[PDB]
Amino acid sequence: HFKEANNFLWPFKLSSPRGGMKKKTTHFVEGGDAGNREDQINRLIRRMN
């Protein structure tokens, strides 16, 4: 029941990244912010939540 739990969860509203984004307009592999940062999503979660 993942579909149902995730649809019971109101989408999280997070604050601005404390410290600050690296660069919003370019992929993470381009030394930016966008895209997939597989392991490193938690470093952003800690400074955003």
Partner: protein, 50 residues
């Protein structure tokens, strides 16, 4: 925002900057996070992060 990216950022329920959601991965999901890749920054959450 393009309309094709605005339809997917609202089937992901991300109608607002700094919104977040959980997503189970498959072909039909990765192929949407590729359409909306320049607008999101997704990854694999820890257990402490969840």
């Amino acid at each position: 925002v393009s309309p094709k990216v605005r339809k997917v950022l609202q089937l992901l329920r991300l109608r607002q900057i700094f919104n977040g959601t959980f997503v189970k991965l498959n072909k039909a999901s990765i192929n949407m996070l590729r359409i909306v890749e320049p607008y999101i920054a997704w990854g694999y959450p820890n257990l402490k992060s969840v």
